[PDB]
């Protein structure tokens, strides 16, 4: 099932020797094991521009790490990991 | 999970340390950092590594004389300080996080025997009544901003205990960490807010900046009790 637990980022953001971008995220809540409920939006925050690689993101448990691949659009990019305000935003420009 | 370091250790002066922490994950995905504290003084930290890579970030001041290495078939990150003076006489401690440090190993006591941003915790110490609101201060000379967020962390110690994250991200509260821990502040400005002030909250509180090497912490902040 879909998780309702706290999240964060564990390393800083490694841009491809080609496009596709990749973040560590972890797991401070309870519902392990889990899918991770991450997207991403607009300079808006709120139209869904974006591609999500890495097939359905697990959340195995509480220090868990999950690598996701992705590849946000042109310009501003503002990735959502969790459900919810409390839930991580993240800004990305890209060149 | 959890971080499991070596044993204390006696040197002479002008030997070398090497101390281990072992965790209970993989350690390939996370920055596994090593935080000094010298006999009653505050959270040094002392630098990262990553240990997918092998990449090293050491704090200026210990640049040169630490080498910090990790083996992601152990899951052990080690640590060794050469050149040993009589001052890195201090507990060391392994870390994991880079929005905070949620995982800290237990701390393991070295004894040696015989620009660059500033981080201002304000005030060095203060004294609140049992039930009232307590405020610490947190000024960075530099933005802690990083994919616009601030990189603004607040922790508690208690004497003889390892560091304890209360806040990442300048308002996330930490799981198992109690309502009344408020945190608030952006750009340069920060602040840790105690509601109602009990017993168990009289400690040390620090803040740290993790957005860019090196994370520096403040100096600390010495909550007590107003003694009538």
């Known amino acids: 099932t879909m998780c309702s637990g706290k999240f964060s980022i564990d390393k800083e953001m490694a841009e491809t020797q080609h496009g596709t971008t990749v973040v560590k995220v972890k797991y401070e809540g309870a519902g392990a094991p889990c899918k991770v409920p991450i997207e991403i939006r607009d300079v808006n925050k709120e139209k869904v521009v974006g591609r999500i690689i890495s097939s359905t993101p697990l959340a195995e448990n509480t220090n868990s790490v999950t690598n996701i691949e992705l590849e946000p659009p042109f310009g501003d990019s503002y990735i959502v990991i969790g459900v919810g305000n409390s839930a991580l935003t993240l800004h990305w420009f890209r060149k | ?228």
């Open chain 2, 1 to 228: 999970v959890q971080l499991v370091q070596s044993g204390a250790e006696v040197k002479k002066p002008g030997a070398s340390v090497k101390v281990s922490c072992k965790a209970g994950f993989n350690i390939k995905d996370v920055y596994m950092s090593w935080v000094r504290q010298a006999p009653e003084q505050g959270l040094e930290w002392m630098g990262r590594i990553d240990p997918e890579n092998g990449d090293t970030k050491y704090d200026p001041k210990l640049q040169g004389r630490v080498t910090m290495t990790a083996d992601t078939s152990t899951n052990t990150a080690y640590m060794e300080l050469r050149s040993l003076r009589s001052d890195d006489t201090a507990v060391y401690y392994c870390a994991r996080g880079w929005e905070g440090f949620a995982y800290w190993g237990q701390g393991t006591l070295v004894t040696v025997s015989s620009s660059d941003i500033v981080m201002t915790q304000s005030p060095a110490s203060l004294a609140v009544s049992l039930g009232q609101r307590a405020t610490i201060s947190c000024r960075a000379s530099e933005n802690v901003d990083k994919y616009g967020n601030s990189f603004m962390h607040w922790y508690q110690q208690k004497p003889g205990q390892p560091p304890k994250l209360l806040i990442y991200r300048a308002s996330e509260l930490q799981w198992g960490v109690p309502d009344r821990f408020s945190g608030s502040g952006s750009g340069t400005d920060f602040t840790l807010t105690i509601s109602s002030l009990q017993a168990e909250d009289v400690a040390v509180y620090y803040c740290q900046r993790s957005n860019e090497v090196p994370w520096t912490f403040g100096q600390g902040t010495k909550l007590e009790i107003k003694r009538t």
